[PDB]
């Protein structure tokens, strides 16, 4: 019977350890795909693989849950954990142990934690994890804007006055309210002065002094 294994599948990480919560949990999914506990064990493999550093295989367990039933009542939990397994690939490594700034690393994991959090705060505004999703989007919108500042910081010492003014113009359209825009705003003024475009350098000079940090 399938009930003799699920009755001993309550020893979680708070009761047992990080290893016993999977051994009797995997044996109920393969041998009973259409059993009694069909969607219960699918919401247990997601949480058990998050704190056991089982990051890539839990991402395949996320997209399986929306694909077979999109009419789930409390679907806000699987969408909130999709953003947490993408932020687990961020600066939580040996580089983060020393205390360095990893804003100029690969932004592919931080940008992947934005398309799912935008659907959570706009689709279900009165959900449970709506408050923590908005507070996590401020750090993600600041980490992605700081990556574009490190690009313009390299292109202003090598010297490229079309590549500098294209990243700050791309920062004024994507991230208009952050600290990296106000810091890269003198970098856009310096590239207009190195060329003969003095009519454009006075427009940036009238917006830095008008917004005193």
């Amino acid at each position: 019977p399938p009930n003799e294994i699920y009755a001993t599948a309550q020893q979680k990480l708070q009761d047992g350890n990080w290893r016993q919560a999977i051994t009797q949990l995997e044996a109920l999914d393969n041998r009973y795909p259409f059993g009694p506990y069909s969607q219960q064990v699918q919401l247990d493999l997601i949480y058990a693989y998050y704190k056991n550093a089982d990051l890539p295989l839990a991402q395949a367990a996320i997209d399986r849950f929306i694909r077979l039933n999109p009419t789930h009542p409390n679907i806000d939990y699987v969408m909130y954990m999709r953003g947490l397994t993408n932020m687990a690939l961020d600066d939580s490594a040996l580089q983060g142990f020393f205390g360095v700034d990893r804003s100029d690393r690969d932004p592919q994991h931080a940008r992947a934690a934005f398309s799912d959090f935008s659907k959570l705060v706009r689709g279900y505004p009165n959900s449970q994890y709506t408050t923590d999703a908005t507070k996590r989007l401020v750090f993600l919108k600041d980490r992605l804007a700081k990556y574009e500042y490190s690009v313009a910081e390299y292109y202003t010492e090598r010297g490229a006055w079309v590549a500098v003014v294209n990243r700050v113009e791309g920062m004024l359209r994507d991230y208009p309210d952050t600290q990296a825009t106000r810091d890269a705003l003198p970098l856009m003024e310096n590239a207009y002065r190195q060329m003969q475009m003095n009519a454009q350098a006075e427009k940036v000079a009238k917006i830095i002094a008008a917004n005193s940090s």
């Binding site: 219960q40 919401l43 247990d44 997601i46 949480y47 009542p73 409390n74 939990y77 939580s92 934005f114 705060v121 706009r122 505004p125 009165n126 449970q128 994890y129 709506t130 408050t131 923590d132 908005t134 507070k135 996590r136 989007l137 401020v138 750090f139 919108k141 600041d142 992605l144 113009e169 004024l172 359209r173 994507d174 991230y175 208009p176 309210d177 952050t178 600290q179 825009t181 106000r182 427009k203 009238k206 917006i207 008008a210 917004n211």
Partner: protein, 54 residues
């Protein structure tokens, strides 16, 4: 987890002076306000919300 998403700097939109209408704010990455009032930090409901019976 970490303590970086709550200790970060808030967002403040800069202003535009006269002569520059600043129409560049027309892209993605917008943060709406949906009355955020709940639990933040480490004290969250990390357990899966299992559905009860009728």
């Amino acid at each position: 987890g970490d303590e970086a998403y709550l200790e970060a700097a808030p967002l403040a939109e800069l202003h535009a002076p006269a002569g520059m209408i600043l129409p560049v704010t027309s892209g993605d990455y917008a943060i709406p306000v949906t009355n955020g009032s709940g639990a933040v930090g480490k004290a969250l409901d990390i357990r899966p919300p299992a559905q009860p019976l009728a």
